[model samples]
Target: GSVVGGLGGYMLGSAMSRPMIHFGNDWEDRYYRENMYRYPNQVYYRPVDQYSNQNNAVHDCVNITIKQHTVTTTTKGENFTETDVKMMERVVEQMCVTQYQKESQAYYDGRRSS
Candidate 1:
């Protein structure tokens, strides 16, 4: 009676693939966390001569904007669909990467006044 089919096969297949999906979710979670940094409550501020407004803008774009986008997008009771993962990727593309590009472009534009 070792024939695997029907309900048994369905359960087995689901069990096998479920872990893979969860693994992807964990990877996405880790990526999201790593992109964010924690700042100290008592950090010294740079003087006007050494200020990095571009850096601050880029940091805020990812840490604050992207973080909010991710939290709001992934908000739910439990479990993430493939569509959820896909949407997060899009958030990364738009809120994370695109913002960085714009910030860098501005920084470079001010760098070389050609």
Candidate 2:
């Protein structure tokens, strides 16, 4: 019957609003929204100028070739039998949690009969 069990005098943080981090709409915050000018370049990229296209061979390719693969497979397996029951049942009627709890409470108070 403690706060963790939802049975205490304390509100138990249920009514408390949580703190959150968010971006701002003010000048400096707006400027920061664009990430282009930010750095520690080492963190963002490595071999730093890799995108500069120093080697034309990388952009221009001479030939590409692929070979077909042949796979031959032979296998075996063992099976154990329990009861052979395979089924999928769709329920048409439903009893919700609150209704169940309501019926449960009614029975507990002797207002309902089994």
Candidate 3:
């Protein structure tokens, strides 16, 4: 067939999906090998000492703070009433002392700084 001219609009539809090229080539191969082990894809990925720091911080806090009253009470009980209850309440107040101090100090510092 001898066609002198083509159609005005052939209108070949295109596929919705398209191919994506990623992570290829020798340089990128070595790069992925070296860097993918660490996998620094997220924000702020490094030695997170503060995470475990606060863990031990809490450990020491409870170790020292609650130990005071519980140890004292248990020891005195080993050796030994409304008077006893009154004395226990006294120790209870002491448990909250450091907490209150830290809270008060935090409030003061926060207000002062910010």
Candidate 4:
């Protein structure tokens, strides 16, 4: 048989996927280390870093931005009703409680920047 060893393709599984004979005597051995890849032929590969990020772990219902609320402001002597001002102020307090109470640990622990 004509010795086929060099150029492009190889004998495949015959012997370490016989690489090109043009290589330096030591190159083929080091270039095709068995430990680096699967038993022989395999498909694509992806590391954990290629996946999604950390935000999903926190959960949207628990996301501080969506869980947050507003604080209202008003001016004095602007014809605002007595009950209106008081009600607005109370509502603002409740909003603040909702926004900060659930996230107090997050605020102090450096987990939540917002």
Query: Which candidate tops TM-score?
Result: 1
Tens-digit lDDT string for candidate 1 (35-98): 3232111111111223344345433333443334344445654344554444344343344333
Query: For residues 25-101, could you state the per-residue lDDT of candidate 2 as single tens digits?
Result: 45434333342232111110012123343122211110000000000111124321211000000000011112222
What's the distance in Å from true for residue 67, model 1? 6.4
- Positional deviation of residue 99's Cα in model 4 after best superposition, in angstroms: 2.0
List residue ranges in candidate 3 displaced over 4 A.
1-53, 78-111
Error at 88, model 4, angstroms: 1.2
| RMSD value for candidate 2 | 31.6
Q: Please state every model's RMSD to the true fold in angstroms.
A: 20.3, 31.6, 34.0, 34.9
Output the better candidate (2/3) by lDDT. Answer: 3
TM-score of each: 0.29, 0.13, 0.25, 0.23
Error of 4 at 65 (Å): 19
Per-residue lDDT tens digits for candidate 4, residues 79-113, read 43443333333233333333333334344554655
Shift of residue 70 alpha carbon in model 2, Å: 48
The lDDT of model 1 is 0.34
The candidate, 1 or 3, that scores higher on lDDT is: 1
* Candidate 3: residue 81 Cα off by (Å): 21
lDDT of each: 0.34, 0.19, 0.32, 0.27
The TM-score measured for candidate 4 stands at: 0.23
Superposed Cα deviation of residue 42, candidate 2 (Å): 61
Order the candidates by TM-score, highest first: 1, 3, 4, 2
lDDT of 2: 0.19
Error of 3 at 48 (Å): 17
